[PDB]
Amino acid sequence: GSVQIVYKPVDLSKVTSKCGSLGNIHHKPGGGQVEVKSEKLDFKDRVQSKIGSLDNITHVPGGGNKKIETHKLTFR
């Protein structure tokens, strides 16, 4: 009845970027407006919410590479 699991990934990989220069970036969005109305809010178990927002983002990561590697075993 003897069961053997040997698990040996060999990951010689690479993720790479070369950029000569990251240039001139302008983020100039106009004046946004947000309006939200209720009489009641009533939240129970494990709710998560964003109920009125205005979000301006410039990321410009300079080589934002990702090597996301979520991984698992399980048994019986």
Place this chain on the structure above:
Amino acid sequence: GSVQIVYKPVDLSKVTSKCGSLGNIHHKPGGGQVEVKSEKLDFKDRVQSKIGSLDNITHVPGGGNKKIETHKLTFR
């Protein structure tokens, strides 16, 4: 009945950037506006919430690389 589990991920990986210069960056959003209304808010178990916000962000990380590598085993 002998069970053997041998987990050994080898990983020689590289996540890499070369950037010659990070340039000229201008985060200039106009004047935003947010308005939010209720008579009542009523939050119970483990609620998490943002009711009204204005968020301006400039990240610009130079090297922005990620090697996220979440993992588990589990048994019986």
Place this chain on the structure above:
Amino acid sequence: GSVQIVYKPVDLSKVTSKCGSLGNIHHKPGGGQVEVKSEKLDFKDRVQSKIGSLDNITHVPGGGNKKIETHKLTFR
């Protein structure tokens, strides 16, 4: 009835950046406005909340790389 669990990752991985200069960065958002109203707030177990905010952020980490690696066993 013998169980043997051997757990030996070999993570020789590297996360790397070269940036030749971090440039000129100008975070100049306009005058924001936020307004939030209620007649009652009522929060119970394990609530966490933000109810009116104006948040301006410049990060500029100059090689903000991440090697996040949450990792585990569990048993029986």
